[PDB]
Amino acid sequence: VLSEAFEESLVARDWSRALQLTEVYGRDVDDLSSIKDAVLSCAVACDKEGWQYLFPVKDASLRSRLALQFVDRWPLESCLEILAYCISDTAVQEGLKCELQRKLAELQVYQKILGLQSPPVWCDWQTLRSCCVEDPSTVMNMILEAQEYELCEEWGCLYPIPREHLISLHQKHLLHLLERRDHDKALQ
Amino acid sequence: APILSVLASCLQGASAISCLCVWIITSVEDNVATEAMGHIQDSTEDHTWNLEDLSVIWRTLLTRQKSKTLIRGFQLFFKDSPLLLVMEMYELCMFFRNYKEAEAKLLEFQKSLETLNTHPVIPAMWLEDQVCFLLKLMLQQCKTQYELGKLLQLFVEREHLFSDGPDVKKLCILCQILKDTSIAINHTIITSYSIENLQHECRSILERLQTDGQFALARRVAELAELPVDNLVIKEITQEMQTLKHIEQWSLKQARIDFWKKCHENFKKNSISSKAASSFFSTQAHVA
Known part of the structure; x- marks a missing residue:
């Protein structure tokens, strides 16, 4: 019954009534971060409010790859902020840092x-x-x-x-x- | 289990400020539920909880990030009373990062703390006792260096808090002072800020700025420390001199005169002490 919750709340990507059923009935253990990151991702690129869902993903490589993938639909007053801390993260592989930095250049x-x-x-x-x-x-x-x-x-x-x-x-x-x-x- | 404590705090004669310890200690993981129990002294059936064990429970839960449990219990139990908002800030910040709403709710917290002051069950002053821990916890734990600047600027005006907290003013000043630099703070000033420790740390920051050559912000940085601004100008001068030698302009008389003149020209703009300039001259003079 508990697992007929995600597999039916990720049909209509309402990832706010489905990031609940992983925190209320979840006994918040450490390794749940990946199961949370998945859904926060799959709801990053599904609506015009994409700005406010690609900050709370812990896996830095995912932050990078997703930002590079979908910098397009964003206002120049927010895509800058989204990129700023990613470029200021101290863990992303140096290969992606160059690309993200170069894009920050054009944004500026x-x-x-x-x-x-x-x-x-x-x-x-x-x-x-x-x-x-x-x-x-x-x-x-x-x-x-x-x-x-x-x-x-x-x-x-x-x-x-x-x-x-x-x-x-x-x-x-x-x-x-x-x-x-x-x-x-x-x-x- | 955790669907028993709620019934427990429903029968006639259960301390509503007690069952919260039972819920929050019996609805987490194993190691979290265990290592928090160290505060206890007596046995299991002889440890009547009070308004003190929640303190260590609160601290232990917040440390090693797990907040969607407290921000969740305080709704079944003692309701919208302000500690809930003082912790509700902590989801929109350091987890969810939509800071514009954080500024909007912190002021609501202040307004409610003032208004309701015009007997509770969370010991009146207990709020002000313990909020000062969520604050330095929200601050010390942040990882990204540029992530710090936004919180440090959010606070700014509401500086009456952080009783033992780091000096907000100079901190935010330094933060803005590198608002685009590649350097990062050290958190050593963050945890233990002192009138002299700031300089004992920032000497390295000044040297690091000096290595790269971006000397412009260095003046503003060292300004906050109220440290001797002397050698920085001389160092910039030496950097220009090596730049010219790389261009080999010292041979051409015109550039040489222009440089030796712009030397004094800029030196006026810095109003350095006489003796330092005398040395800066006499050294090249003996070199000449």
Whole structure:
């Protein structure tokens, strides 16, 4: 009778009336964490509220793999937080750390871009990445529209840019840097 | 068994603040049920429970994480009385991690503690006696270093607590001071924070920051410690000098003059003590 509870509460993935029957009638022993992690996973990617179910899974490798798998449907105000502590975990294998870190890079870049103007140069992570797939010129123009060169450095670093105007981009920053006599920055 | 104690605390004349020990000690695993019993002295049938054995039971259960049992008993037994919320914070934090609701419920706890103060069965002051243990337990036990920062910033305003707890202010300051650095705290200050132990520890943190070169945050870090800011500037200067030698710019006169001038230029921005600058000069002077 107790085991006709999961195998019927994981038909409709209501993993809050089925993570109960593993804590109330469960005599909470240590090794139950795996049976809990399974369900919390299988309910991570089933709804638009995916943000708040991939924190409480103890197996770090699962945290990583799932985040890399489903960073897509997330708002840039929450996927950042989800990735932060994973990249700050002290146990994940160093192989996955590089990938998760690299994705954090693009998340940060699209955040900084997404707000230079007072409103929408995009709609979310999604819109801005779609546009970056699209004509990568309006974004570069807006990036230079603040003369904030360093951000454009990344905004192209993730997106190769024209072999002609790249020089016109590169020199102007050196000019601005020299304008204040910042020797080492110009050297770099 | 644990469907007997509930009937037990239903007959005429059972101490409602007693049967809770029986439930919470007879509805856990073996080793947990055993190692917690060390507080007892008498035999099984001659150990009338009181408002003291629950203390060691509470502590033993929280240590070696198992909280969905207490957060569960306190509903059958003594109801919404504030200790329930003081522990209910502990599920939304350090397990479930939706901190925005944690901030919303802690203040409700404070409001209720004040309002209901305007005879109970959990010894009035017993709350304030024991909440200060759930606090340092929620704090010491956290693993991820960046996981610490969110709790340490959640507390912030409500600093009246942590009677013997670590100094919240400087702690959160250091936390924000590495809000994106790769370093991690040592918990040595966390468990036992002292006016001098902080520096005896943070000297290593400053050296670690110095090795990497990200010297900018180092000033803010050492600032909190109120330690001598001297050698940091000189070290940054030496780092620049080695950088130039790597670029081999010391041969070209123009860069050499520019560097020797920006030296004093920046040194003004730091307002270092005279003698340190005198040494910083005279050393290269004898080298020159």
